[PDB]
Design an enzyme around this catalytic site. Structure first.
Site, mmCIF file in Angstrom:
data_model
loop_
_atom_site.group_PDB
_atom_site.id
_atom_site.type_symbol
_atom_site.label_atom_id
_atom_site.label_comp_id
_atom_site.label_asym_id
_atom_site.label_seq_id
_atom_site.Cartn_x
_atom_site.Cartn_y
_atom_site.Cartn_z
ATOM 1 N N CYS A 184 139.467 48.158 25.525
ATOM 2 C CA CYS A 184 140.543 48.679 26.362
ATOM 3 C C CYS A 184 141.904 48.433 25.720
ATOM 4 C CB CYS A 184 140.492 48.043 27.751
ATOM 5 S SG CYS A 184 141.982 48.292 28.745
ATOM 6 N N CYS B 171 150.990 41.607 42.976
ATOM 7 C CA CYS B 171 151.431 41.425 44.354
ATOM 8 C C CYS B 171 150.237 41.326 45.295
ATOM 9 C CB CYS B 171 152.360 42.564 44.784
ATOM 10 S SG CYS B 171 151.683 44.223 44.573
ATOM 11 N N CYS C 202 141.510 50.607 49.164
ATOM 12 C CA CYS C 202 140.102 50.966 49.151
ATOM 13 C C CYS C 202 139.787 51.879 47.969
ATOM 14 C CB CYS C 202 139.709 51.647 50.462
ATOM 15 S SG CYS C 202 140.361 53.319 50.655
ATOM 16 N N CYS D 144 96.218 23.246 26.104
ATOM 17 C CA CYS D 144 96.530 24.492 26.797
ATOM 18 C C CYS D 144 97.166 24.235 28.156
ATOM 19 C CB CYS D 144 95.268 25.340 26.962
ATOM 20 S SG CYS D 144 94.549 25.920 25.408
ATOM 21 N N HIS E 276 112.279 10.654 37.111
ATOM 22 C CA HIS E 276 112.905 9.829 38.137
ATOM 23 C C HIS E 276 112.969 8.368 37.712
ATOM 24 C CE1 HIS E 276 113.699 7.600 41.722
ATOM 25 N NE2 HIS E 276 112.437 7.261 41.917
ATOM 26 N N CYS F 190 116.778 9.491 46.178
ATOM 27 C CA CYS F 190 117.346 9.352 44.848
ATOM 28 C C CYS F 190 118.258 10.532 44.527
ATOM 29 C CB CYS F 190 116.241 9.239 43.797
ATOM 30 S SG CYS F 190 116.839 9.096 42.098
ATOM 31 N N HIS G 74 90.602 27.593 30.624
ATOM 32 C CA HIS G 74 91.809 27.797 29.839
ATOM 33 C C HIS G 74 92.960 28.110 30.783
ATOM 34 C CE1 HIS G 74 94.182 28.663 26.257
ATOM 35 N NE2 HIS G 74 94.598 29.775 26.834
HETATM 36 ZN ZN ZN Z 1 142.846 52.064 30.625
HETATM 37 ZN ZN ZN Z 2 141.546 51.836 52.214
HETATM 38 ZN ZN ZN Z 3 114.508 10.168 42.177
HETATM 39 ZN ZN ZN Z 4 151.375 45.268 42.039
#
Ligand code: ZN
Ligand code: ZN
Ligand code: ZN
Ligand code: ZN
Ligand code: ZN
Ligand code: ZN
Ligand code: ZN
Ligand code: ZN
Lengths: 95, 96, 76, 445, 78, 89, 90, 82, 103, 97, 83, 105, 93
Positions: free
Chosen positions: D3, D62, D67, D145, D241, D255, D401
């Site tokens: 941008c 500001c 919306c 395993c 722990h 704990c 397994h």
């Molecule tokens: Zn832009």
């Molecule tokens: Zn609005």
């Molecule tokens: Zn603990």
């Molecule tokens: Zn503004």
DNA sequence: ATCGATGTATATATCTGACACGTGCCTGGAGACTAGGGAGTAATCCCCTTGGCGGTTAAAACGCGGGGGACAGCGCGTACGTGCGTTTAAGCGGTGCTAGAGCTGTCTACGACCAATTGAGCGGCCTCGGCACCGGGATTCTGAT
DNA sequence: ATCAGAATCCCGGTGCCGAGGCCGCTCAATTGGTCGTAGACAGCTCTAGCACCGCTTAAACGCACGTACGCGCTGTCCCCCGCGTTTTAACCGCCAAGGGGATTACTCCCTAGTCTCCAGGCACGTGTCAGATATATACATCGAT
């Protein structure tokens, strides 16, 4: 040539996820693979024993949870159960 | 000249810091082949099998030596004795 | 004295409680009437959750009070 | 463009200081004016004296008012030359030669600090484009395993934002440590989301301190395990722990912390015996949230009516003095004082005979605006609320397994996931399963 | 033959376990124990190889034989 | 006369009825989301017109918002103010 | 004169007052948005619900990693809750 | 018309500046929030914000600390807190 | 795939196939392989974290079996679990009795 | 009056208890202890008498084996009286923690 | 009803007879606490195992098969109760 | 002979063993000679154990067999003791063993 | 309801060995449990061998090597001889 | 050495309840015929294993001497063994019954099988920098004085 | 307390081969769809686990008195350890050589399956004597003389 399977890629991925600047040798990789296989067979045997004791021919997640709780010590089994429940939650969230 | 007991502790530390195999490979392999000759003849063996056999035997011997040392310490002595090894193998349940 | 506790269905109950009693006492009184395990019971009063080992007189709980009984809903 | 008519007056200092001095006084009048004289002096036109015949503009130099519908204030500029008018309805400045308001000049918008306007342009700055709303997700570090969803609704909570941005706690804190006090850690998060840390792992450092602080008091609520989201809600609001009474310089029931002054209410209970209807002894009980059942109900008013529904005591030993007989009285709960933000909790769980529990997946209708005139204890005018937060949970009673939904200014909803932040329509969140609800004060008639 | 495990090897193995002073019959004792253990493990491995319908003992056979006796060892493809 | 409409507005604020008629007017419109619908209109106006001119926007939204006021909101307030005007006339 | 004629003018006075109040607040808020941010862009809206406000999908976990301040380690996002249970308990 | 409105109730030259003295003693007044209902149904120390969701969060960011500061708390932070 | 749907790294398909061919039961559930993969991933992540810590304690970048042995023997739960398990090139812990120490 | 020398009654009771095979531990106190121990894991539990008898038999066999190992350790220690350090060494060699 | 002080139910002559069965000639006065502790640990372990097996069975009564399985898993297989 | 147990000249049910092997989820396919072999092995083991138990019962001048006789028979043999070293028998008892050092001179 | 066991077979074996010796119920249950445990052990060993050799079926050779690995020298040799004799008698018929 | 006494081995009546035997009926085992897929066998490739040779060098072997460690022998006084009076808690006979274990009818929703496919998983190459090796100086114990 | 003398750690420099990334590759997990039944659910039936009391009684507890050995101390003999000198075959690197392990294609036979039919073994009921129980008698054995 025989196309054999292993677990190097997944173990290396997990290592790089938990440690980026860290290497590993082949002996440690073999040790980890053997340990993974041992744990897997132990858990599978426990699940089968529970299924046979309960007269059921189906292995659900409840049997696996009880087996991993019985096989592992208290805190470790609790942590594994929490991880498994979290994975099941993440899998059931999506599809 | 050093006094007795210092070199022993130094060797203990040096061997606890190391991880290599204190037994040579060729006599162990020859003994393994001589033992396996009784069960079956004309048998081949891989190097990894012999290495694993040596590792397991050394681990078992180290565990037995630790148990014998613990038993000898409980026995108010400092020097191990075959009776300590016998008692350890009896309590372990391996010996009949 | 007697206080009021709101159940899960909205109905209120009455329990005979004393000011010297702790929360462990009312956790049993709700159980003999409903059978709900105390570990899942969450008692909320004035937006504060009741903690173990503390009496009702410390939380400024007076006669004829109103409690809130709720449960947990876990997730992750 | 700007941008030019407002830019011409900006060339002079005394003329610019004069218009900036009167608007601060004009805005001070509208904030402290009795509604009776408000229409007779600030909304009454000077030509037709019609009340609210459009936009009523007060003059700048500001005390003339005209919306808008009849160009009464516009004629004031065509005859005397006052094209700058302030609308008494909002306090904004309108230009007649540009035919538009001036909403691109922060000087008139911050004219209350016009005396120190030379300093704000140097030592302060405007928010960024991406951080003007603080939209950022929280990275899920596990089962957190339920934690991130509670912080998300507090981030977009206008009461918490004003309390955090005012720097009340930071200027009165004794320890001033982010890793020790909850309030000092929450200030780091709002600084990380709404501001910028001097000088993607971003916008997530402040969330780490919350996990470190919570672990020092209760490690169970550290996000490692799946916990309840409602329990975390009452836990964090109580510590705030506790931090406030710690910062006190030196008796009172109520704990003065951010929680007790916002979310604290008070209930009212009455035990009506049917003997003489002179009951009863009124007991006032404060509260911070409301738990409501949803069994066999579909609308939010139905759940609130059941809370206000009278109930008869069947296991209450009673001895009246009015009728002097053992009778089964009637219990009724009333609302005494309403808080500023109302939070509602829905009990989406039921109890069975075998001890198990079942989640209530029934959809509950809830409107965006909630009237609370039918639930007051002591006619009543209209009191309206507004929904701003929704926390949704999806799963079972022990597994699920959490996804939160929160609304921000402008009527926009969002989806607040862990790491996904995204928008969402308004009608979509009204259909999700809501677990927690957030209703804030909007208007009291 | 059996004399391949000389005195210094047994002394080093005892020093690793923490032994400070060693007797004179411990050498023969550990020799006999190692002989029995090797006999058992070699019998198990030979049985496994004969059931495998092969003539070369592999590392997997030794791993299985050690797992059978409760002595599972990692680091050999087990 | 021109002073007739001023007196009725003068007594209306003196008697205290002017504040309540403004309260119930905003109450019924907010309960039906009428404020939300007019806010959707203005944001759409800035998109089609591409201008921030107040008189240009107000010339469009003000005549448009008149008919969207439902008859249910109209017939109740006019019935209530008739009870208020006839108190003196 | 009639009674219903004046009542319409009274209602029309309050209608234009509230209408001009809403539009005046919306024009100034939009005026400040484009003036302060000439390059302003709206958040991205996804009709399908698969993108965030910036038009991106949800990043995989734990593809990211967080730098801890207690130990200086680059711990992943999902593993952070498990790491804090051990570095802080030292 | 009835003279009852003229008896005891009862272009102008008044100005909006005449109400400056009366504006210096009345408390904060809201638009659509009745003061009588506050003490009747709300707490006396309850914080109130009229239409909080009308405008976004108005705040500024500092140059040195970058803290999101309210408009009323800008001058206080720059003196003994920045 | 399916591992991304659960946020894991271990293959779910291979575990499901091993459970099918393992002859442990007639039918296999859908949630069991995800649970097993999550448990295995947590275990190997813990092991790798401990190994990386042990390697950083020795100022190294590549993990040696000695670091694995030290990480396994230093823990209590892992020692209780892996009690009857031996590691090649592992070694023993530097333990010395109090009675063998001189004056 | 007649008085036996120390050690005779001990050997007599040893022979008597090695000949018989009845349960040296009585039923009610062991059952109450088992119920108290089981109360900590889960409340409101019921048990069959066969399970309690099996638990008692297993505990008695384990205690007999532990006492035999303790006696072996005490004999190797050039002593006769047993001490808690003997049980500690037995549990250490057995690998029990 | 809660139980208490049942650990003292293992009287001195009971442990005395248990040691006499094992061949012990002379017993000291500090063995009872260690024996009680070891027995309590073993009972806690086997009871935890049995309670887990029973909880997986979705029952409220502990049978003998659960105890047999718990003993078999711990390397303590016991005969004379079926299975 | 209609039954497979009579054709092989055994006492244990071959059909029951075959059904338990097919339903025990031990393998996919089952052979024909495995059940007969298993039944013969089990029969030999039970025959040896019953021989030892009958000898132990005849040594005590009793008509029936008590678990004490089974405990004595398993603890007296070496191969059966090594095979059942970790097996506990209810109501079995211990062996009459007394150390020489504890005996008086 | 119904419940299978091995009481009659052990009774027949006892009568074929000791025709003048009885047996209690506890000893019968002990023998039943022992037989079940041995059967489970042999079946598990055969399954492990079949899975190590990558075989989907189980023949008499697997049971033979399992009883060889499980039982000591003399006992395993006698069991293998008895099993081979039984297999030959069954195949001849 | 001998003598007394004290718990232990053995003969004998007898009552009974757990063990041995008859009986009915049902369902899992036995007969008979078929498809079809896992397994034995013939053939081929190569790489994985075994065998021999040259050197030189750290490890193994033998002897000196010696001092600290293993071991025999005496003092002792206290903690454990043995016996007796006291009673207190352990053990047998039934007592009521109800919450939980066990069997049965019924519906379905979750799991196996199958056709296409493609991309995540595996074999082969390759460069380099983290690690292996070595020389030198400072550092840290250790024993005689 | 002190200090000469080895042992050992750290720093700087030089060199090297295994690993992480890469490219080409291909085959088993994924998706959409259908059909089948083990399992969840509700209902009914029964049964033994538990508090209860009442009475009887052997074992647990406390107290006196006596004794013998675990520990401490002394002294006395001797045998592994530290060091030096002589021997030796393990290992390293290289070169030949072959045969058993791994892989592919062929046929073929045996067994999982299905339909049909019967008696072996299950619970249930009933008769019965082997051994526990109690009394009395002869005796092996241990403590003090
Ligand atoms: Zn832009
Ligand atoms: Zn609005
Ligand atoms: Zn603990
Ligand atoms: Zn503004
Ligand atoms: Zn603070
Ligand atoms: Zn009354
Ligand atoms: Zn840290
Ligand atoms: Zn600042």
């Amino acid at each position: 040539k025989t196309r054999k399977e292993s677990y190097a890629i997944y173990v290396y991925k997990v290592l790089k996820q938990v440690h980026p600047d860290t290497g590993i040798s082949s002996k440690a990789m073999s040790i980890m693979n053997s340990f993974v296989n041992d744990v897997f067979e132990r858990i599978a045997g426990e699940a089968s024993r529970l299924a046979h004791y309960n007269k059921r021919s189906t292995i659900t997640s409840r049997e696996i949870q009880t087996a991993v709780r019985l096989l592992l010590p208290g805190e470790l089994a609790k942590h594994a159960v929490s991880e498994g429940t979290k994975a099941v939650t993440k899998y059931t969230s999506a599809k | 000249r050093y006094r007795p007991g210092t070199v022993a502790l130094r060797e203990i530390r040096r061997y606890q810091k190391s991880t290599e195999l204190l037994i040579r490979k060729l006599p162990f392999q020859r003994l393994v082949r001589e033992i396996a000759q009784d069960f079956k003849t004309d048998l081949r063996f891989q190097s990894s099998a012999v290495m694993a056999l040596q590792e397991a035997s050394e681990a078992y011997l180290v565990a037995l030596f630790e148990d014998t040392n613990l038993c000898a310490i409980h026995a108010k002595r400092v020097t191990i004795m075959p009776k300590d090894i016998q008692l350890a193998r009896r309590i372990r349940g391996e010996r009949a | 004295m007697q206080i009021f506790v709101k159940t899960l269905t909205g109905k209120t109950i009455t329990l005979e409680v004393e000011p010297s009693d702790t929360i462990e006492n009312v956790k049993a009184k709700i159980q003999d009437k409903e059978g709900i395990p105390p570990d899942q019971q969450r008692l909320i009063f004035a937006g504060k959750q009741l903690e173990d080992g503390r009496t009702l007189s410390d939380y400024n709980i007076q006669k004829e009070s109103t409690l809130h009984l709720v449960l947990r809903l876990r997730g992750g | 463009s700007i941008c030019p008519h407002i830019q011409q007056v900006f060339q002079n200092e005394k003329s610019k200081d004069g218009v900036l001095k009167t608007c601060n006084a004009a805005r001070y009048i509208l904030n402290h004016s009795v509604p009776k004289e408000k229409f007779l002096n600030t909304m009454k036109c000077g030509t037709c004296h019609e009340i609210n015949s459009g936009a009523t503009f007060m003059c700048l130099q500001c005390g003339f008012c005209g919306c808008w519908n009849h160009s009464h204030f516009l004629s004031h500029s065509k005859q005397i030359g006052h094209i700058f008018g302030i609308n008494s309805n909002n306090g904004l400045l309108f230009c007649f030669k540009c035919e538009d308001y001036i909403g691109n000049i922060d000087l008139i918008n911050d004219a209350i600090l016009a005396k120190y306007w030379d300093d704000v342009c140097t030592k302060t700055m405007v928010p960024s484009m991406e951080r003007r709303d603080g939209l950022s997700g929280l990275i899920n570090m596990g089962s957190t395993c339920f934690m991130s969803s509670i912080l998300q609704c507090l981030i977009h909570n206008p009461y918490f934002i004003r309390h955090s941005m005012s720097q009340i706690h930071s200027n009165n804190c004794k320890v001033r440590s982010p890793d020790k006090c909850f309030s000092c850690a929450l200030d780091k998060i709002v600084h990380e989301l709404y501001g910028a840390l001097n000088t993607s792992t971003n916008r997530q450092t402040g969330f780490i301190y919350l996990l470190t602080c919570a672990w020092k008091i209760n490690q169970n609520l550290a996000g490692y395990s799946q916990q309840d989201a409602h329990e975390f809600w009452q836990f964090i609001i109580n510590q705030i722990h506790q931090s406030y009474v710690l910062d006190l310089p030196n008796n009172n029931k109520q704990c003065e912390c951010i929680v007790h002054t916002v979310f604290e209410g008070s209930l009212e209970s009455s035990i009506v015996c049917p003997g003489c209807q002179n009951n009863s002894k009124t007991t006032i009980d404060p509260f911070l949230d409301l738990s409501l059942d949803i069994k066999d109900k579909k609308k939010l008013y139905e759940c609130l009516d059941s809370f206000h529904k009278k109930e008869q005591l069947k296991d209450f030993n009673y001895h009246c003095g009015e009728c002097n007989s053992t009778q089964d009285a009637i219990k009724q709960l009333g609302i005494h004082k309403l808080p500023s933000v109302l939070v509602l909790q829905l009990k989406r769980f039921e109890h069975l005979l075998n001890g198990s529990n079942r989640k209530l997946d029934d959809f509950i209708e809830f409107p965006t605006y909630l009237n609370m005139k039918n639930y007051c204890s002591t006619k009543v005018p209209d009191i309206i609320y507004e929904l701003i937060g929704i926390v949704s949970h999806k799963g079972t009673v022990n597994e699920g397994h959490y996804i939160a939904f929160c609304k921000i200014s402008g009527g926009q909803w969002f989806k607040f996931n862990d790491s996904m932040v995204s928008s969402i329509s308004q009608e979509e969140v009204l259909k999700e399963q809501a677990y927690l609800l957030f209703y804030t004060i909007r208007q009291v008639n | 033959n059996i004399q391949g495990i000389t005195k210094p090897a047994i002394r080093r193995l005892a020093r690793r376990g923490g032994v400070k002073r060693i007797s004179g019959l411990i050498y023969e004792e550990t020799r006999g124990v190692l002989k029995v253990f090797l006999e058992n493990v070699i019998r198990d491995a030979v049985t496994y190889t004969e059931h495998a319908k092969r003539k070369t003992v592999t590392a997997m056979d030794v791993v299985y034989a050690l797992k059978r006796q409760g002595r599972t060892l990692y680091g050999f493809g087990g | 006369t021109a002073q007739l409409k001023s007196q009725i507005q003068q007594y209306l604020v003196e008697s205290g009825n002017y504040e309540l008629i403004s309260n119930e007017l905003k109450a019924r419109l907010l309960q039906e989301g009428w404020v939300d619908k007019v806010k959707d209109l203005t944001k759409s106006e800035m998109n089609i017109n591409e201008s921030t001119n107040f008189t240009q926007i107000l010339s469009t939204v003000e005549p448009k918002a008149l008919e969207m006021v439902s008859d249910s909101t109209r017939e109740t307030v006019l019935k209530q103010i008739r009870e208020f005007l006839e108190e003196i006339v | 004169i009639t009674i219903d004629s004046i009542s319409n003018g009274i209602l029309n006075n309050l209608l234009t007052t509230l209408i001009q109040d809403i539009v005046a607040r919306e024009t100034t808020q939009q005026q400040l948005l484009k003036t302060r941010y000439p390059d302003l862009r709206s958040y991205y809206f996804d009709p399908n619900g698969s993108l965030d406000i910036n038009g991106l999908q949800k990043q995989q976990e734990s593809s990211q990693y967080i730098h801890c301040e207690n130990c200086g380690r680059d711990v992943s996002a999902n593993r952070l809750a498990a790491h804090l249970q051990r570095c802080l308990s030292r | 018309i009835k003279p009852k409105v003229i008896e005891e109730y009862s272009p102008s030259n008044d100005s909006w500046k005449s109400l400056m003295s009366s504006a210096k003693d009345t408390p904060l007044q809201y638009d659509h929030m009745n003061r009588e209902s506050l003490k009747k149904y709300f707490n006396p120390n309850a914080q109130l914000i009229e239409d909080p969701l009308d405008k976004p969060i108005q705040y500024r960011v500092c140059e040195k600390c970058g803290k999101p500061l309210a408009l009323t708390a800008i001058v206080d932070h720059l003196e003994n807190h920045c | 795939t399916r591992s991304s749907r659960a946020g894991l790294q271990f293959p779910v398909g291979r575990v499901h196939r091993l459970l099918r061919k393992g002859n442990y039961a007639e039918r296999v559930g859908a949630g069991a392989p995800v649970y097993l993969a999550a448990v295995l991933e947590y275990l190997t992540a813990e092991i790798l974290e401990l190994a990386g810590n042990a390697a950083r304690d020795n100022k190294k970048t590549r993990i040696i079996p000695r670091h694995l042995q030290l990480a396994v023997r230093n823990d209590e739960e892992l020692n209780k679990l892996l009690g009857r398990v031996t590691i090649a090139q592992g070694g023993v812990l530097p333990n010395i009795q109090s009675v063998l120490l001189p004056k």
